[PDB]
């Protein structure tokens, strides 16, 4: 019981959500679009889904009632859209509204909490406003909701030691942002997918914002580096980077990777993932203690 | 106890060859070049090799010594490059020649036997030129070899029912090439990978061409369609497409769509994978009957 439709199942986090829902025990439906047809590694991905028991539902964002058709089948929709890919979610929102059977929607939120980013930095701000547009469509339709926020994906922030331009630990030299004493929240993407699978039929998170702040994984950038140093037995030579040398030459001197560099600043310089605090009734590791979340020392071991 | 380096592991057949080596029991080294510490799905491929026991080897084609080093850790280097990808092999073959320690090399050919392609014309021809340009460079260095040819990947030619323009079964209509009585070879790509992992170490094939031609998988597109409509229960509205109409106006289409049109013609009209016969000393399924390779029935069943 609890039939779940996943839209965005070809995305980085959406792979993981489908497999987390299958293993949690939901009836997991996966929307198939004119996806591939065209691209090989997304058919095989979908084939791998059905070999585990996912049910394929064809639909298009161009075809409004194909979307109503997907969502008639389930109790809960989960979106993981990783062009304007966040704002296409509004085509789905009114599909859910026309259908009316939906007991919950979880929009594509799996990073910084958007209503806390009112004075974010252009162009980075576009993300949070586009996501806030979708919330409003939801709440204006009276669609019950859950928003999963709070944690940097370990692959994009923890395995590269928070460097940019690489997704792997460095070989001798590492940049520290500011003094390196600002605390960031890291979470293995698998554990975000599992927390997502557990919260969607949980009565205690209906119409609420769930934070993913696993206590062992609340780290300053400098502690994270030290973890890597201890696994390896080698210090890295470290250059501290002052705030204004961090946004140096953003101007339009990089393609809108400018959005990423700005999100990085809010996290690593201002500490927006940690500048407030959350209760046990709204944080994921307290709500689902059965989930043994991968600590960042274990994440990093995968790279030795 | 056979050591194998796999170059091109991020590629389509590359992935499985890495995985088929490990399942057969060789010490499987995988070249990791700078290109991959980018694009998550390549780092997360590579660390899922690590979880399966592969050993990561760093190097660059632009650093001839780094390939020299890798090629010394190993008894056999396999290449599987799915443009520039075919003749960059040449600067590996020099790293293997200057090496001297490598008992077998397998260049990237898992398509059609190139010295039979004296008849195609540009632009389809070029990859055959490049493929034998790297063979002439292998036989010239005297590096012992094995070329592995003669099968359509089931994902590209079977599961789409040999329609171009998609990789999924057609919902109502199909195009039959010719009267559709030209029979070609279909191999599950997993099967092409495990064959290569077993002929790697085997004295029978050293310095010979081994053909992947499963007996029960030599079919024309017509019965392969009928296979699908057995499994499905519906008849597909066939439309035969005559050889001249199929290449009508090819010179006025984009010059990779030419290549694909030429490619499909050699297979489904000229019979390039059938125009020939092969015995048992030379045909993978007979040298390795411990494979219960997948027939296009069971393969196409994955889609229903």
């Amino acid at each position: 019981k609890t039939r779940v439709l996943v839209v965005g199942a070809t995305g980085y986090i959406g792979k993981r959500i489908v497999r987390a829902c299958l293993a949690e025990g939901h009836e997991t439906y996966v929307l198939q679009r004119p996806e591939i047809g065209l691209e090989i590694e997304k058919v095989q991905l979908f084939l791998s889904f059905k070999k585990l028991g996912a049910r394929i539902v064809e639909g298009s964002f161009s075809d409004h009632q194909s979307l109503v058709s997907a969502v008639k089948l389930v109790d809960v929709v989960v979106s993981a859209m990783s062009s304007h890919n966040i704002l296409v979610q509004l085509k789905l929102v009114e599909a859910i509204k026309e259908a009316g059977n939906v007991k919950r929607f979880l929009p594509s939120e799996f990073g910084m909490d958007p209503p806390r980013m009112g004075h974010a930095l252009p162009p980075g701000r576009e993300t949070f406003d586009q996501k806030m547009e979708v919330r409003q469509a939801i709440e204006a339709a009276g669609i019950p909701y859950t928003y999963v926020v709070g944690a940097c994906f370990a692959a994009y922030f923890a395995g590269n030691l928070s460097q940019m331009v690489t997704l792997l630990p460095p070989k001798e030299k590492v940049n520290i942002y500011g003094d390196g004493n600002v605390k960031v929240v890291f979470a293995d993407e698998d554990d975000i997918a599992k927390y997502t699978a557990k919260t969607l039929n949980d009565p205690r998170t209906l119409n609420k914002t769930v934070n993913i702040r696993p206590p062992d994984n609340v780290l300053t950038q400098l502690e994270l580096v030290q973890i890597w140093e201890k696994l390896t037995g080698k210090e890295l030579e470290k250059t501290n980077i002052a705030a204004q040398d961090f946004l140096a030459n953003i101007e339009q001197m990089e393609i809108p990777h400018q959005a990423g560099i700005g999100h990085f600043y809010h996290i690593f310089y201002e500490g927006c993932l940690t500048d407030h605090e959350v209760g046990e009734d709204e944080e994921a590791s307290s709500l689902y203690p059965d989930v043994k979340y991968k600590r960042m020392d274990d994440y990093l071991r995968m790279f030795l």
Side-chain angles (χ1 to χ4, degrees), chain A residues 1-35 37-164 166-304:
Chain A
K1 342 190 212 87
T2 316
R3 304 172 295 300
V4 172
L5 174 58
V6 178
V7 186
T10 37
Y12 182 68
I13 193 76
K15 291 145 85 95
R16 293 129 202 279
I17 286 179
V18 162
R19 295 190 276 246
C21 295
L22 286 173
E24 172 72 12
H26 312 312
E27 305 278 292
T28 296
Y29 300 78
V30 174
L31 189 75
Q32 200 186 274
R33 307 176 306 152
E35 37 87 40
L38 322 168
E39 227 141 18
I40 187 66
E41 283 122 21
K42 321 179 161 124
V43 307
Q44 315 240 49
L45 172 75
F46 266 70
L47 293 179
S48 88
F49 288 163
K50 34 191 308 185
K51 295 172 162 152
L52 302 185
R55 299 199 226 175
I56 304 309
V57 169
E58 290 170 272
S60 202
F61 287 106
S62 321
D63 182 0
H64 167 71
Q65 287 247 345
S66 91
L67 298 193
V68 194
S69 290
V71 312
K72 301 121 167 82
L73 306 165
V74 309
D75 306 320
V76 171
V77 176
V78 167
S79 168
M81 311 291 299
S82 72
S83 182
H84 285 143
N85 59 309
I86 311 176
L87 281 178
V88 64
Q89 290 186 90
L90 310 158
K91 275 154 227 152
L92 169 67
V93 177
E94 34 193 1
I96 286 154
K97 191 195 185 199
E98 174 162 322
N101 50 281
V102 181
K103 307 306 178 298
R104 197 176 307 208
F105 183 26
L106 279 74
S108 183
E109 303 216 338
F110 290 89
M112 297 138 82
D113 199 2
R116 306 191 39 96
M117 308 301 304
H119 301 341
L121 223 41
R125 205 186 303 192
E126 287 188 19
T127 320
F128 319 121
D129 292 302
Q130 286 180 40
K131 261 182 230 189
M132 279 295 313
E133 196 166 334
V134 175
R135 307 215 172 179
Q136 274 133 33
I138 288 163
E139 295 151 358
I143 285 163
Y145 63 86
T146 286
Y147 309 136
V148 172
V149 314
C152 284
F153 292 1
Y156 284 113
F157 297 98
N160 52 15
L161 297 189
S162 300
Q163 311 299 259
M164 279 140 283
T166 193
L167 290 166
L168 298 183
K171 298 285 329 177
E172 262 276 307
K173 261 299 310 166
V174 77
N175 288 342
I176 308 160
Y177 303 116
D179 298 307
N181 193 161
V182 185
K183 297 206 279 259
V184 187
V185 180
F186 304 82
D188 184 322
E189 298 92 12
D190 286 332
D191 306 323
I192 290 158
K194 197 187 283 103
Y195 287 132
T196 298
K198 275 175 187 292
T199 200
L200 57 92
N201 61 3
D202 179 0
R204 318 169 280 172
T205 52
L206 188 74
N207 301 315
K208 311 288 269 163
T209 285
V210 186
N211 276 245
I212 303 192
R213 206 182 301 194
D216 291 353
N217 287 350
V218 164
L219 295 186
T220 84
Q221 203 237 340
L222 192 53
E223 318 188 287
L224 174 78
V225 187
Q226 287 155 10
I227 295 183
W228 181 248
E229 280 170 340
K230 167 186 226 170
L231 307 180
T232 44
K234 66 166 274 191
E235 265 204 21
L236 308 148
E237 311 292 58
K238 325 179 195 52
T239 292
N240 298 55
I241 305 306
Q244 294 46 50
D245 301 334
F246 182 72
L247 306 135
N249 275 338
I250 182 161
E251 275 282 63
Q252 266 272 299
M253 279 228 35
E254 42 208 20
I255 284 274
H257 150 74
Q258 297 156 35
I261 203 91
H263 296 187
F264 214 94
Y265 182 86
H266 299 311
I267 285 164
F268 283 75
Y269 281 82
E270 303 180 334
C272 73
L273 300 178
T274 74
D275 63 7
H276 55 296
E277 248 162 0
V278 298
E280 290 187 6
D281 50 293
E282 43 172 5
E283 193 288 320
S285 70
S286 275
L287 285 193
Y288 319 96
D290 44 310
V291 169
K292 296 289 153 303
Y293 59 87
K294 204 202 271 301
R295 275 67 184 166
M296 287 308 123
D297 63 317
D298 279 320
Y299 203 93
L300 288 180
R301 271 191 191 85
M302 310 192 298
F303 304 77
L304 300 182

